[PDB]
Design a protein around this ligand. Structure first.
Ligand SMILES: CCCCCCCC/C=C\CCCCCCCC(=O)O[C@@H](COC(=O)CCCCCCCCCCCCCCC)COP(=O)([O-])OCC[N+](C)(C)C
Ligand SMILES: O=P(O)(O)OC[C@H]1O[C@@H](O)[C@H](O)[C@@H](O)[C@@H]1O
Length: 352
């Protein structure tokens, strides 16, 4: 079976080399694409706008993002994926021949397993959710049967253009293989379609949120400990993304599996706290609820303040402190977006 993996890996290496040699002028564009395709944006800028435009779409988007990322982490641990930027320097394949010369970039060195691709899955799920929601909302046009079809065609072309751009960006930076991005896209599509039939998430008590979060934490930690007690470790990539990196400062703690898990669980718990609170009821379910200026002000403030607040970086000297502070920091963005800032605007606008 290893021959097939070698064949796909060699095809990915050749694709990366061709893209890097024949299109040397597009490195800035692909770096920008990879930066934009981050889930940080999905949690910081995409969620507030959709939540303050239509609550159900925002809740669905956040749930899809968090659950898809958790499933991605679990399947990354299960599948034992690889990356080109250390495989090309570690493999025995290019022994009787010449090693292809692929170049590494500051946003290339990643400390997690390869398949499935996280960027492709995370972007596919969120953008499918947004496109489907928009198409569902706009079934009210003046002249139908050609204008609605025009909008449908335009949106479904844009979605696939975005997906192709993200796949090419991940391949160019020598961070993923061509099959991993396709698998990630299909998995994100499947997850976004599966959450279209689950309805016991829009009105859930804090007890259910707490139990779901604790189960998600405990399953991952128990999986890690159970495997660690049987002779296999799921953190083997931290020693491969360290020697095979051109510069030492390019390897960051922010991309480790524990950091991602803690951030996801913090976001979910923060949403659970924000939804079941007195401030949320007093602000988002009052007289200034559907008023357009209030919602626009909420979007603007929750964008500006969140952008400024993202500049507070927890210390990385001690790993446990970093993890707990990452959880606490990720638990705040739902809170500030949903409960606090709308409350402040409610006591500002309607209290003269
Ligand atoms: C069409 C797509 C639309 C999606 C929205 C794109 C927003 C991009 C963005 O906000 O860039 C932001 C950076 O972005 C980052 O900071 C990247 C995350 C890295 C931060 C560190 C990781 C932890 C800054 O860009 P802007 O000045 O806010 O515009
Ligand atoms: O492996 P990919 O597809 O290049 O993306 C990996 C990224 O996927 C994201 O889901 C994780 O939060 C990041 O920590 C990780 O770096």
């Amino acid at each position: 079976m290893e021959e097939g993996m070698n064949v796909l890996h060699d095809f990915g290496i050749q694709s990366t080399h061709y893209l890097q040699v024949n299109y040397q002028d597009s490195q800035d564009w692909f770096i920008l694409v990879s930066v934009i395709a981050d889930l940080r944006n999905a949690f910081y800028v995409l969620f507030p706008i959709w939540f303050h435009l239509q609550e159900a779409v925002g809740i669905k988007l956040l749930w899809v993002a968090v659950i898809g990322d958790w499933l991605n982490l679990v399947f990354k641990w299960i599948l034992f994926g690889q990356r080109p930027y250390w495989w090309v320097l570690d493999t025995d394949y290019y022994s009787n021949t010449s090693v292809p010369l692929i170049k590494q970039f500051p946003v290339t060195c990643e400390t997690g397993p390869g398949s499935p691709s996280g960027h492709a899955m995370g972007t596919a799920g969120v953008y499918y959710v947004m496109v489907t929601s928009t198409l569902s909302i706009f079934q009210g046009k003046i002249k139908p049967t050609y204008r609605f079809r025009c909008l449908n065609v335009i949106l479904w072309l844009g979605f696939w253009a975005v997906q192709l751009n993200v796949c090419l960006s991940r391949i160019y930076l020598a961070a993923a293989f061509p099959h991993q991005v396709v698998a990630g896209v299909l998995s994100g599509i499947a997850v976004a379609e599966t959450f279209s039939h689950i309805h016991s998430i829009y009105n859930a008590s804090l007890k259910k949120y707490f139990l779901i979060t604790f189960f998600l934490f405990s399953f991952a930690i128990g999986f890690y400990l159970l495997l660690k007690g049987l002779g296999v470790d799921l953190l083997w990539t931290l020693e491969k993304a360290q020697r095979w990196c051109e510069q030492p400062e390019w390897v960051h703690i922010d991309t480790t599996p524990f950091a991602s898990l803690l951030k996801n669980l913090g976001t979910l718990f923060g949403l659970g706290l924000a939804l079941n609170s007195s401030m949320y009821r007093e602000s988002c379910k009052g007289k200034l609820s559907k008023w357009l200026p209030f919602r626009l002000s909420s979007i603007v403030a929750s964008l500006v303040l969140l952008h400024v607040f993202d500049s507070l970086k927890p210390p990385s000297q001690v790993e446990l402190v970093f993890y707990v502070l990452s959880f606490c920091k990720s638990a705040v963005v739902p809170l500030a977006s949903v409960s606090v800032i709308p409350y402040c605007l409610a006591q500002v606008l309607g209290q003269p």
